[PDB]
RNA sequence: GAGCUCAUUUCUUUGUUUGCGCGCCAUGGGCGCGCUCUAACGGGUGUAAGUCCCGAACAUGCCCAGGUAGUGGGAAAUGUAUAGCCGAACAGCAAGGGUGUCUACUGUGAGGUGGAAUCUGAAGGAAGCUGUAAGCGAAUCUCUGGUCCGACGGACAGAAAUCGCAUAUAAGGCUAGGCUUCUGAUAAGCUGGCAAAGAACAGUGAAGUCUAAUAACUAAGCAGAGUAAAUGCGGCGGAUAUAUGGAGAGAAAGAGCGUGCACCUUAAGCGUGGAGGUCUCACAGAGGUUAGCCUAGUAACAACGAACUGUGAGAAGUCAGCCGAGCCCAUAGUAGUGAAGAAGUCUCUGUAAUGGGGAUGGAGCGAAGGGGCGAACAAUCAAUAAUGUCUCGUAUUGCAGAAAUGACAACAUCUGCCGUAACCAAUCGGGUAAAAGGUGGUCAAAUCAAGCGAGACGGAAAGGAAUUGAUUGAACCGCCGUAUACGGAACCGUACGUACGGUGGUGUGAGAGGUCGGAAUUUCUCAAUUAAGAGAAAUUCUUCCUACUCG
């Protein structure tokens, strides 16, 4: 019980807190917020911890109330550190320093390496499905404390950032019977895909696992998505594959239900009637174009880069003509982007028919790319080829 | 640049002048009555032709094709070509109105007046004027197409308000494509990538009806992609003088002018009125200074400061539903209205609500804008002995790990085809725990048992199952009924048009735009490539507005 002081050991709880509070967390059923646990960590602070070194505490109904999300981050933060020496390497999720696009990688890898049957892995429902005492004993093979089985009880059948490690924990006997039998994979948290070699040893390994997952573990494989696939028909963390014509070389993409994703937002960004700036329309925009390549910056986007360029510039011409309102300022405002006076009064009495309009000639010259660039629109091949070519 | 394609309406609104009361007047409408006309101009049928019928010159539309245009012909359709109506999102004139600006006069001043410049002269009364393009142009009756209406409300609650279904990780429409299967005329309307409504232009186009004439020359289905300030489809009922597209009857009315009517009505016309507040001046008081000079500053409040309050004479000047029944102030019980008849009373009959007649009555009824009090409405807030548990022992059970010895060499797990094939990855026949194999022995545990719990048994801790009073509703979006006007019949609008009555919704922020007025910069023109200047054009800032978009 000597880890019980370094899981209560007050820098660790600062240093909790500190992370809470740059979480930015929510509220509960009870309704404590994140800003108020400094003087109750002040008035109540030796109470948890005698309640916490006593085994008596107390739980809640979710998002979970910010003490106990804040303890949990307190266990969880030394947690770690003694479970990250028995993960496997192709563990991906919630751990330090290993995000999505090393699973990715790490799947192209065993991709090119001759591996080339995927056995899809969906895993039913995870944390309503594994059975609490199998796990705690689990987690009682290496660790002298068990206060765990309090939060692990009364928040189920009543997360934070102590659910996603247990989670790890809890797979981490699946990785390890997977370099037992020898077959490669990459795992985000309850995300896991197997490469083999052929069809039939892909159909032999899926009944296996799922006879291990099944029995051995004590969770359900979902048999509706679990599918054996090709590195052409997989959707795995947002990432679809496919075959490129070089040598034997398999590459990622972003898979078209992820670049719906991204077309819905930025439609929704650039609507014509919504009532903020276009400098705001922009800004935001910029912000969700910032925040979708970097994440499938492995990859190749050159001409989806290409036409998502084209389609928000087509969307932001739309929304600047909408938000000029009138045939007065439509034509004063393309008179002074370079159009001749003529023109410009012949297409801005043209002023609905917007889409049409912003389609071409006297709008798609004068609100140019240069225009829009100069505007403070970043563009998407230009910062897919600036963050990765 | 969007995706070889690709070149667009030189337009107006929903959004910013005015919006009060009372009175007058039609140049508007209603009912009469007269006088003229009415089918290119002629004929016929006839008692009666505006109606019914027949007659042909040539200009456009369309066809005849002759890549397109020009000569020569031909089938429908239209015009010249009905009396006459109307006047464009067409011009011109325009009485008037606004201006913190420039200038002359005037007043002690608040201000006023006349000019100059500029905006405007409007969808609600100079019932503005003039000239048009285009459009229209005959009672009734039947059939039919299109459109619109049967509120609003993302179409729920509500409400006096047509039904049903669908509709935002978007119905639906539309735009540009892709793949398969494959004779025209009239022309309301529909659509043109979507806030929705109209106009322009273009393409199409329902229902009937008409026409199948002549001569040649020089589209549907299918999946997707893109695009929305949301409605779409069907049933039922109604409207339809933009004199709605037509078809059939129909000897049927239509138009202009004049004139009557204690006939009716209208918001920018004409008279008149103007409080409450806001300023200006002069007197008195209240004071800084020793009755003599000053009385404001702080948008405003609060609060300092001598700077406050009356009286009189003046000046500009109102005027929009948002939650308001009623009362109070002052113009004011005055203007106005009423004896061709009020208030009050009775009686009859309507609406969801506002009402409308009839009898009696013998004289009252009665404004404007602004502010205050405020019943009420909507929202938010405040005052007003069981079970389960607490802690001790007893019997346990969930899940690790270690393993005396048995039973089978059979269970797991991982690479994953065979033949034809002169060589096929089901490119060919099958099959996907297919061949051929590699690796770990597998299971049961007699016993032993960590750590965390979990319900049971027993004895001692216990506990208990309406009103009043405040604050907010700043500012708006509409919609419907009746009366009444208009743009542009419907739709959409004119501050929800306005007046009264009824009914839902948004919530004090940001953005975008418009802008009477002012200031500045550039590009010109002007002289002569002088003028701080005059005529401008463009842009920016400022003042004002939030009806618009999103929350
Ligand atoms: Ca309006
Ligand atoms: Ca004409
Ligand atoms: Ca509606
Ligand atoms: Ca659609
Ligand atoms: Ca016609
Ligand atoms: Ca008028
Ligand atoms: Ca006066
Ligand atoms: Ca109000
Ligand atoms: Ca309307
Ligand atoms: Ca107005
Ligand atoms: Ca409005
Ligand atoms: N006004
Ligand atoms: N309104």
Redesign the pocket.
């Given at each position: 019980?000597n880890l019980m002081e370094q899981i209560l050991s007050s820098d660790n709880l600062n240093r909790a807190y500190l992370q809470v509070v740059r979480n930015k967390g929510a509220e509960g059923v009870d309704g404590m917020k994140y800003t108020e646990l400094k003087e109750h960590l002040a008035k109540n602070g030796e109470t948890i911890k005698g309640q916490l070194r006593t085994?008596?505490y107390k739980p809640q109904p979710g998002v979970p109330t910010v003490t106990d999300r804040f303890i949990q981050q307190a266990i969880a933060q030394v947690l770690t550190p003694i479970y990250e020496e028995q993960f496997h390497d192709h563990s991906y999720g919630f751990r330090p320093n290993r995000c999505a696009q090393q699973a990715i990688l790490t799947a192209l890898n065993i991709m090119n390496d001759?591996?080339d049957?995927i056995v899809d892995i969906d895993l039913e429902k995870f944390f309503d499905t594994v059975?609490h005492?199998?796990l705690?004993?689990?987690i009682?093979?290496t660790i002298?404390d068990?206060?765990v089985?309090?939060i692990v009880?009364k928040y189920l059948v009543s997360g934070g950032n102590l659910s996603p490690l247990l989670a790890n924990i809890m797979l981490n006997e699946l990785d390890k019977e997977m370099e037992?039998?020898?077959?490669?994979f990459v795992r985000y948290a309850d995300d896991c895909i197997?490469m083999?070699?052929?069809?039939?040893?892909?159909?032999?390994?899926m009944?296996?696992?799922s006879?291990?997952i099944e029995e051995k573990l004590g969770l359900k494989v979902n048999m509706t998505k679990s599918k054996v696939d090709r590195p052409s028909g997989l959707k795995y963390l947002g990432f679809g594959f496919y075959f490129d014509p070089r040598a034997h070389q398999f590459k990622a993409k972003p898979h078209a239900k992820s670049v719906?994703?991204f077309?819905?937002r930025?439609?929704?960004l650039?609507?014509?009637?919504?009532?903020?700036?276009?400098?705001?329309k922009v800004e935001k925009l910029n912000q969700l174009i910032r925040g979708w390549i970097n994440y499938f910056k492995i990859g190749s986007m050159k001409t989806l880069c290409?036409?998502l360029?084209?389609?928000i510039?087509?969307?932001l011409?739309?929304?600047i003509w909408?938000?000029?309102?009138?045939?007065?300022?439509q034509?004063?405002?393309l008179?002074?982007l370079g159009?001749d006076?003529?023109?410009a009064?012949?297409?801005?009495?043209?002023?609905?028919?917007?889409?049409?309009?912003?389609?071409?000639?006297?709008?798609?010259?004068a609100i140019?790319?240069?225009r829009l660039a100069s505007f403070g629109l970043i563009s998407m091949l230009d910062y897919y080829i600036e963050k990765c070519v």
């Open positions: 019980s085994r008596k001759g591996n049957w059975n005492d199998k705690m004993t689990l009682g093979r002298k068990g206060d089985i309090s009880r037992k039998r020898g077959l490669n197997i083999v070699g052929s069809e039939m040893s892909a159909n032999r390994v009944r296996n696992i006879r291990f719906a994703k077309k819905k930025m439609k929704e650039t609507c014509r009637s919504w009532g903020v700036s276009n400098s705001y290409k036409e360029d084209s389609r510039r087509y969307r011409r739309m929304c909408k938000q000029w309102k009138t045939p007065q300022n034509e004063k405002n008179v002074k159009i006076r003529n023109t009064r012949r297409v801005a009495y043209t002023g609905k028919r917007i889409a049409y309009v912003c389609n071409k000639g006297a709008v798609n010259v140019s790319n240069k």
